[PDB]
Design a protein around this nucleic acid. Structure first.
Ligand SMILES: [Mg+2]
Ligand SMILES: [Mg+2]
Ligand SMILES: [Mg+2]
Ligand SMILES: [Mg+2]
Ligand SMILES: [Mg+2]
Ligand SMILES: [Mg+2]
Ligand SMILES: [Mg+2]
Ligand SMILES: [Mg+2]
Ligand SMILES: [Mg+2]
Ligand SMILES: [Mg+2]
Ligand SMILES: [Mg+2]
Ligand SMILES: [Mg+2]
Ligand SMILES: [Mg+2]
Ligand SMILES: [Mg+2]
Ligand SMILES: [Mg+2]
Ligand SMILES: [Mg+2]
Ligand SMILES: [Mg+2]
Ligand SMILES: [Mg+2]
Ligand SMILES: [Mg+2]
Ligand SMILES: [Mg+2]
Ligand SMILES: [Mg+2]
Ligand SMILES: [Mg+2]
Ligand SMILES: [Mg+2]
Ligand SMILES: [Mg+2]
Ligand SMILES: [Mg+2]
Ligand SMILES: [Mg+2]
Ligand SMILES: [Mg+2]
Ligand SMILES: [Mg+2]
Ligand SMILES: [Mg+2]
Ligand SMILES: [Mg+2]
Ligand SMILES: [Mg+2]
Ligand SMILES: [Mg+2]
Ligand SMILES: [Mg+2]
Ligand SMILES: [Mg+2]
Ligand SMILES: [Mg+2]
Ligand SMILES: [Mg+2]
Ligand SMILES: [Mg+2]
Ligand SMILES: [Mg+2]
Ligand SMILES: [Mg+2]
Ligand SMILES: [Zn+2]
Lengths: 204, 46, 178, 134, 110
RNA sequence: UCGCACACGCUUACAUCAGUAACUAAUAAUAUACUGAUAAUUAACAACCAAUAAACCAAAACAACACUAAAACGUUUAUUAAUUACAUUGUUAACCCAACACAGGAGUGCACCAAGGAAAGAUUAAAAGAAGUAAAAGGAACUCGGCAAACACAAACCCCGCCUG
RNA sequence: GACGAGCUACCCAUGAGCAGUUUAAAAGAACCAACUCAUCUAUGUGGCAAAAUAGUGAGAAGACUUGUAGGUAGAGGUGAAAA
RNA sequence: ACCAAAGCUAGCUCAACAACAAAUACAAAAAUACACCAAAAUAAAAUAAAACAUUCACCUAACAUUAAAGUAUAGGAGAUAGAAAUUUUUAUCCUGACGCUAUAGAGAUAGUACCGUAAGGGAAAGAUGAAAGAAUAAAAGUAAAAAAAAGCAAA
C-alpha cells in the first residue's frame, strides 16, 4: 500500500493504472471535506438493500456493491448511472457501458426486509451480547448482508490440489507442552549428541 | 596559472579530515554534529 | 534440482489455485518437530515462487497467480511468531529477563538516552581498547543542546494540536449537525 | 542464517547450528552463454560461499563441485519528481558447477498453451448517418 | 556599441515585414506527365527519379553478388535482364544480370 | 597522428533489445552520453594478512672498487604461534578536476604503429580582420627601440649584478 | 567562537623519473629531447580559457622536477621579503 | 487568437490550559583480542558620550504584580545608571482570535534539490468536477492589421 499525505480516491484502487493516471506522483489537490463517521457509528455495508432519496433516480431500491469509507461513498448496482465507453481505437468506439456513479451516504437509507421501507438504523446490543441493527421507525431487527469474498473462492465448493493440506491433518493437535525449546527438541529427536560446551564470554 | 581546479579528489583525505570519527574526537567537532542535528541535516558528516 | 520449478504440467496455465496461508491458531497445535519440518516445506515453495517471479520478469510476461507469494510469506511470518513465543515465554519462566539479548540504558555523546545492545568480546571491558574510547556520558555544553530539542519537540506537538482544533471547527460550521 | 547474532567462537566450542535457515535463493536464467555445468543464483547479500554450498547440498541434494561469487551494483542514477535519487538494490550473484558430470539447462517456463467488427462509414453515403433508414 | 534605445514595435514591423524579407512566389512549378506530381521546370521529377534510384540500387546489389570481392570488377560491358528475356547476339559475350521483376515500362529494351 | 594498461578519482554514464513528436547533443542524421525494459564484472592478479630475545662497523651507482653529501629496503639461531576444502572484499565504461559532451590540469609502465582519429552542413569567391607563402630595384631609409620577420644566426664595446639558483 | 594546508608557502615520512651527444667527469660544465618553468610578439578580451592558444624562448643529474600520505591556523602560520 | 488569467485549501502565526531484528564512533552503519582514560582559566567589542581613553542600561540570575520612585544615591558629578525599608494582589474553572491565505503565513510540499573541501548557506512550486471505473478571454509581449515629407508626439 502506497499513500501520499493529500490524496483523492477516484473509485480507482490506490495501487492501479487508472489511479496513477488520475493522480500522478506529484499532485496535491484541494482538501476533500469528509463528515466524520466513526467505524462503530457506521450503519452501512456492501450487499444490503437500500433506498435512494436523492437525485433524478429516487424512491428506488437497490443492492450495494462496495463502500469506500475514506471519502464516504456507497455503490448501488446499476442504479445511479452515467455512460462510459470502454474500447476506443482510431476507427472504432466499442462497448458503451452504463456505469455506477458513486452516492453519498446522506442520500441512502437502509431498507428493512419485511415491509421494504427506508429507515434509520441504530445499533443495539442484545441481552446475549450480539450487535444488531434496530429500526427506529419500524421497530425491527435489520440483518447485515452476508456477502461473498473478494477472491471468489467459496469454501463449500473446494478441492485440494497437490499442495493443499487436508482439513483433518491441519486440525490435528500434535503439541506436547514440555519445557524444551525448538533447539533441544529437534536435536534430541534427530539424535545429534553434543558434548563440549561454550567457554565463558563477556558482554559489552 | 589557471585556477578553479583547486579540489583534487581523494577518498582518504576526505574521510580523514571531515569524517565522523574526526568529528567525534574533539569537543568542537561534537558541537558541529550537534548543531547539524538541531538543524536536522540528511548528512551529518562526510 | 527440479524443486525450483512448478510441476511440469502446471507451467503455461494462466491461473493456479492454492489454499489459505497458515494462521497462528493452526500452528499452535503442532509440536516442535512438526513446525521445524513445516519450515522447509515453506522454504522450498518460497524459492520456487521467487524463481518464477524473476523468470516472469525476464520474459516480459505477467506472472501467474501472484497471490501465492503473498501467502507463503505470511505462513513463514506466522511460523516465526509461534516459535518466538515459545522461546520468549520459556525464557521468562526460567530467567525472568524479558529481552533476549543483554542490553543497557546509556547516555551517549550527544546527550540522547539510548538503548545500548551489548556485544560479545573475548576479554573484559577494562581491557578492551575500542570499548574504552566509546564515551557514554555527556559534557556540560551538551546541556544547552539537550534543552533545544526538548523545546523543538514541544513546538511540533503544540502546533499539531492547533491543527486538530481547526479541523473540528470547519467541519462543524460546514455541516450543521444534529 | 541472516540478521541473527552468532555465538562468539573460542577454542572447543559446540559446532555452530542453525535449525531454521533464514536465507532465500533465486535461480536465474544466465544473461550470457555459460557451460552446461554452470547454474546461477542470486543470493542474499550476507551469505558466504560455504553457506551456499551447504545450503544447496542439504536442502536440495545437489552435488556441487565449485562455487564463485561477485557483487552487483545497482544504479543510483534515476531521479524522482522531487529530484531525489532512486537506488536499485545491490545484490550478490553466485556461480555453481555440478560435480557428477551433470548438465543443467534452463527450463522454458512459458510453453504458449492457452485455454472482427467493421462498422466503417460508407464511401458513397457522403457522410449521411446510415442508422436512419428514411 | 550598445543600442541607445529599445526600438518600438512600429519600427520593427517596418524592418522585418519589408517586401525583400518576404518569401517570393515561385512561378516555374509544373506537373510531370507520368506520375502527375509537382516538379520545377529545370529540375528532374522527384517522384520519377525515386523509382529510377531504387531500381538502380537493387540492380547494383545483384551485381554486387555477381562479384566476389571488394576489388574485383568486370572487364566486359554489362547487360541487365528481366523475367522471360534471352540475350541478343549484339549483347552476348557480356556479363549478364538476371532479375525477377518483369521489365518496367519506363525502362526500354533497346 | 597524446596509443593500449595500471594507480588515484568517478559511480551504471558500460552491455542487449526497443522508442525517439518533444526533452540530452550547443544543430541534423542516429545513440557511447536522451527514455523504458531487461541483463552484467566469476581469482591464481590486487586488498586483508605474528610477536619477543640475540648475533651482524662495512652504500646504491652492470659494482671489480671507490667518491663524499655518508646512503631506502633482512637473513639466520632460540622461545611460543588456533591448524582444519571452500573467508570476506576490488574487477563494466567512451570515465576524473575545471558551472559545459570545456582547444586547459592530471602520476606510472611499455608503444610510434599492428593501434587511435577526422581540419570542410551547403555554396559564393566583396571589403575589413586573423594565419601562411612568394616578390623587381633598394637593404633599417621604418620606429621609442632591428619590435616582428628573415636565403641571416656572426663579431666587438659599456653600466649593473660576481656565478647555477 | 567555529571551520579550512585535497590550492598555494615551508617542512616530515615513503615512492618514482632524467634518453641521447660531448668530455678522464653526474662537474649547482657544454649541446639538445621527455619533463619543468614563463622571456618576447601576435591573436583572444561575455575568450576554447574567471590568465588560454600559436610561434619564440630559458633550465634540462640538480638549491631538479613529480606521486601518495602527515604536520603548522588568522592577535596566527609560512616566507632564497615580493607586506 | 496566442501567451496568459481567475478560485480555496495545504498549512501556518500568536495565546490559553497542561514496525522490529541486525549494524553501528575501522575511513559511523564492518560480529570477534591487551587497555588506558579523561580535562579545566571573568564574556568581549560594535555602539552611546556628536572625538575619545574612566564610564555606556538589555545581554545570568530569577522573580513576579500595584506602589514607595525615576526618589535615596552612583557618575570624565558628563552621557547616563538606580535601589531598599515599608506596602498591594481570591479560588479554580470559561477558550480562542477586529491573526495570515500559496510573492502572505513557518525557511518548509524540505533543512530536501542545488551551492560550499569544510563550518555553512539554502530554494522553487498546489488549483475542473458528485463522479475522469464520466471529456473569464480583461496586465505587459505579440498576432489579426509594415510604412509615406514635420520634429517630448500631444493639444
Ligand atoms: Mg569552485
Ligand atoms: Mg563471496
Ligand atoms: Mg571475487
Ligand atoms: Mg580503480
Ligand atoms: Mg535536439
Ligand atoms: Mg576499493
Ligand atoms: Mg580502486
Ligand atoms: Mg577497467
Ligand atoms: Mg571555467
Ligand atoms: Mg562552416
Ligand atoms: Mg581579404
Ligand atoms: Mg599578410
Ligand atoms: Mg617570406
Ligand atoms: Mg624585395
Ligand atoms: Mg632611423
Ligand atoms: Mg624617421
Ligand atoms: Mg637609433
Ligand atoms: Mg627579434
Ligand atoms: Mg650611461
Ligand atoms: Mg644575476
Ligand atoms: Mg643550472
Ligand atoms: Mg595535511
Ligand atoms: Mg599538503
Ligand atoms: Mg643525461
Ligand atoms: Mg648543467
Ligand atoms: Mg610566425
Ligand atoms: Mg638551452
Ligand atoms: Mg647555459
Ligand atoms: Mg621558495
Ligand atoms: Mg622590499
Ligand atoms: Mg612596498
Ligand atoms: Mg562615539
Ligand atoms: Mg550620531
Ligand atoms: Mg572616530
Ligand atoms: Mg557591554
Ligand atoms: Mg512560502
Ligand atoms: Mg557536495
Ligand atoms: Mg493585451
Ligand atoms: Mg506636425
Ligand atoms: Zn514524374
Amino acid at each position: 500500500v502506497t499513500l501520499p499525505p493529500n490524496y483523492r480516491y477516484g473509485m480507482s484502487r490506490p495501487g492501479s493504472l487508472s489511479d496513477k493516471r488520475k493522480n500522478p506522483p506529484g499532485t496535491r489537490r484541494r482538501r476533500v471535506p469528509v463528515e466524520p463517521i466513526s467505524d462503530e457509528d457506521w450503519h452501512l455495508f456492501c450487499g444490503d438493500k437500500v433506498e435512494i432519496l436523492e437525485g433524478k433516480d429516487a424512491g428506488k431500491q437497490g443492492k450495494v456493491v462496495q463502500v469506500i469509507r475514506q471519502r464516504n461513498w456507497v455503490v448501488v448496482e446499476g442504479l445511479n448511472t452515467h455512460y462510459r465507453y470502454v474500447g476506443k481505437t482510431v476507427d472504432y468506439r466499442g462497448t458503451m457501458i452504463p456505469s455506477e456513479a458513486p452516492l453519498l451516504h446522506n442520500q441512502v437509507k437502509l431498507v428493512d426486509p419485511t415491509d421494504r421501507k427506508p429507515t434509520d438504523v441504530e445499533w443495539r446490543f442484545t441481552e446475549a451480547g450480539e450487535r444488531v441493527r434496530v429500526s427506529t421507525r419500524s421497530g425491527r431487527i435489520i440483518p447485515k448482508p452476508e456477502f461473498p469474498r473478494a477472491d471468489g473462492i467459496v469454501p463449500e465448493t473446494w478441492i485440494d490440489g497437490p499442495k493443499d493440506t487436508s482439513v483433518e491433518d491441519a486440525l490435528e493437535k500434535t503439541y506436547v507442552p514440555r519445557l524444551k525449546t525448538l533447539e533441544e527438541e529437534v536435536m534430541e529427536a534427530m539424535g545429534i549428541q553434543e558434548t563440549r560446551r561454550h567457554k565463558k564470554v563477556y558482554w559489552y | 596559472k589557471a585556477r578553479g581546479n583547486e579540489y583534487q579528489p581523494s577518498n582518504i583525505k576526505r574521510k580523514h579530515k571531515h569524517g565522523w570519527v574526526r568529528r567525534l574526537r574533539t569537543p568542537t567537532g561534537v558541537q558541529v554534529i550537534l548543531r547539524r542535528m538541531h538543524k536536522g541535516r540528511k548528512s551529518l558528516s562526510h | 534440482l527440479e524443486e525450483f520449478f512448478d510441476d511440469p504440467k502446471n507451467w503455461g496455465e494462466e491461473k493456479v489455485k492454492s489454499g489459505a496461508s497458515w494462521t497462528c491458531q493452526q500452528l499452535r497445535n503442532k509440536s516442535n518437530e512438526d513446525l521445524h519440518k513445516l519450515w522447509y516445506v515453506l522454504l522450498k515453495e518460497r524459492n520456487m515462487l521467487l524463481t518464477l517471479e524473476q523468470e516472469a520478469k525476464r520474459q516480459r510476461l505477467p506472472m501467474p497467480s501472484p497471490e501465492r507469494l503473498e501467502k507463503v510469506v505470511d505462513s513463514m511470518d506466522a511460523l516465526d511468531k509461534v516459535v518466538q513465543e515459545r522461546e520468549d515465554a520459556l525464557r521468562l519462566l526460567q530467567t525472568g529477563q524479558e529481552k533476549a539479548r543483554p542490553g543497557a540504558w546509556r547516555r551517549d555523546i550527544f546527550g540522547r538516552i539510548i538503548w545500548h545492545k551489548f556485544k560479545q568480546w573475548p576479554i573484559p571491558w577494562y581491557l578492551n581498547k575500542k570499548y574504552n574510547r566509546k564515551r557514554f556520558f555527556a559534557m556540560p555544553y551538551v546541556e544547552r543542546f539537550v534543552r533545544m530539542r526538548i523545546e523543538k519537540q514541544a513546538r511540533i506537538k503544540a502546533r499539531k494540536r492547533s491543527l486538530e482544533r481547526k479541523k473540528e471547527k470547519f467541519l462543524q460550521e460546514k455541516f450543521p449537525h444534529l | 542464517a541472516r540478521n541473527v547474532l552468532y555465538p562468539l567462537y573460542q577454542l572447543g566450542n559446540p559446532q555452530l547450528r542453525v535449525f531454521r535457515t533464514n536465507f532465500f535463493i533465486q535461480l536465474v536464467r544466465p544473461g550470457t552463454a555459460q557451460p552446461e555445468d554452470t547454474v546461477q543464483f542470486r543470493i542474499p547479500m550476507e551469505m558466504t560461499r560455504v553457506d551456499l554450498r551447504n545450503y544447496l547440498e542439504r536442502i536440495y541434494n545437489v552435488p556441487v563441485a565449485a562455487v564463485r561469487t561477485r557483487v552487483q551494483y545497482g544504479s543510483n542514477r534515476r531521479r524522482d519528481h522531487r529530484n531525489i535519487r532512486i537506488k536499485k538494490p545491490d545484490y550478490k550473484v553466485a556461480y555453481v558447477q555440478l560435480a557428477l558430470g551433470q548438465t543443467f539447462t534452463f527450463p522454458d517456463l512459458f510453453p504458449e498453451r492457452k485455454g472482427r467488427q467493421k462498422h466503417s462509414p460508407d464511401p458513397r453515403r457522403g457522410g449521411v448517418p446510415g442508422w436512419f433508414g428514411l | 556599441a550598445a543600442p541607445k534605445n529599445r526600438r518600438s514595435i512600429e519600427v520593427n514591423r517596418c524592418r522585418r515585414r519589408n517586401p525583400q524579407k518576404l518569401i517570393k512566389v515561385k512561378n516555374n512549378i509544373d506537373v510531370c506527365p507520368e506520375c502527375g506530381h509537382l516538379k520545377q521546370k529545370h529540375i528532374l521529377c522527384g517522384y520519377c527519379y525515386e523509382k529510377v534510384r531504387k531500381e538502380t540500387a537493387e540492380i547494383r546489389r545483384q551485381m554486387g553478388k555477381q562479384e566476389g570481392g571488394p576489388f574485383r570488377a568486370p572487364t566486359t560491358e554489362t547487360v541487365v535482364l528481366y523475367s522471360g528475356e534471352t540475350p541478343s547476339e549484339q549483347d552476348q559475350g557480356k556479363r549478364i544480370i538476371e532479375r525477377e521483376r518483369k521489365r518496367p515500362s519506363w525502362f526500354t529494351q533497346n
